[PDB]
Structure 1
Amino acid sequence: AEAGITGTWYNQLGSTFIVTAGADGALTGTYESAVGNAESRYVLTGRYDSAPATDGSGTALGWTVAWKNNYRNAHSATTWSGQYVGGAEARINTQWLLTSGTTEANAWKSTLVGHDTFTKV
């Protein structure tokens, strides 16, 4: 993990995420959407649990991205929760929660759930 996590990751839609896993559990980087324009780039911050292993378990981690930068303010934030698996074909399997700010009446429609798998290729 750590060194293994550091780098560029891609999901099945083209989104790219670049992260640095620091010695003490920190995850910092940026997430870029499709198109790949100068700024479809948002800041991401998270944590990972290193021990992590004598039985091949994955490394648990999570990060958040608030969808606001100098070109867009989508009034929402997404958190990804999952684990990193290293090896020939390392990947990060996650489940995500995307919450949008709503009025109290619309709170029922505030959170979408999905999943993403990131690879180094």
Structure 2
Amino acid sequence: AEAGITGTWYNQLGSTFIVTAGADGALTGTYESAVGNAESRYVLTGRYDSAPATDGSGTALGWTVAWKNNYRNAHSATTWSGQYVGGAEARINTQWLLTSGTTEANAWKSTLVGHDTFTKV
């Protein structure tokens, strides 16, 4: 993990995410939306739970991206919760929650749920 997590990850929609996993559980980096234009980049911050694993379990982690930068303000934030599995074909399997700020009346429809799998290729 940590060294194994640090790097560029890609998902099946065309998004790219680049993270540095720090020694004491920190996850810092940027998320880039498709097109890959100069600033389809947003800041991401998260944490991972490092442990001794004598049974090949994955490393639990999560991160958040607020969809606001100097070109866009989508008034929403997404959190990804999942685990990192390293090896020949390392991947991060996640489930995410995307919440939009709404008025109280629309709070019932404020959160979407999905899943993403990220690979190094």
Q: TM-score range by the shorter chain?
A: over 0.9
Could you say which residue in structure 2 is the equivalent of 1:103? Answer: 103
Cα RMSD (Å) of the superposition?
0.5
With over 3 angstroms needed to count, the CA separation of the structure-2 counterparts of 1:52 and 1:62, relative to structure 1, is farther
Task: List per-residue Cα deviations over 1:18-72 (Å, max 9, x = no partner).
Answer: 0000000000000000000000000000000000500000000000000000000
Contact 1:62 1:82 in 2 (8 A): yes
Gaps of 5+ in 1: none
Shift, 1:5, TM fit: 0.1
Output the CA distance in 1 between the equivalents of 2:86 and 2:105. Answer: 44
Gaps of 5+ in 2: none
Q: For 1:4, what is the secondary structure of its paired residue?
A: coil
Contact 1:93 1:117 in 2 (8 A): yes
Output the CA distance in 2 between the equivalents of 1:93 and 1:50. Answer: 16
> How high is the TM-score relative to the length of structure 2?
0.99
Contact 1:52 1:58 in 2 (8 A): no
Output the CA distance in 2 between the equivalents of 1:6 and 1:67. Answer: 22
Output the CA distance in 2 between the equivalents of 1:103 and 1:52. Answer: 45
Output the CA distance in 2 between the equivalents of 1:114 and 1:52. Answer: 30
With over 3 angstroms needed to count, the CA separation of the structure-2 counterparts of 1:33 and 1:52, relative to structure 1, is farther
Output the CA distance in 2 between the equivalents of 1:14 and 1:98. Answer: 18
Point out 4+ residue stretches in structure 1 off by more than 3 angstroms.
Answer: none
Output the CA distance in 2 between the equivalents of 1:36 and 1:13. Answer: 12
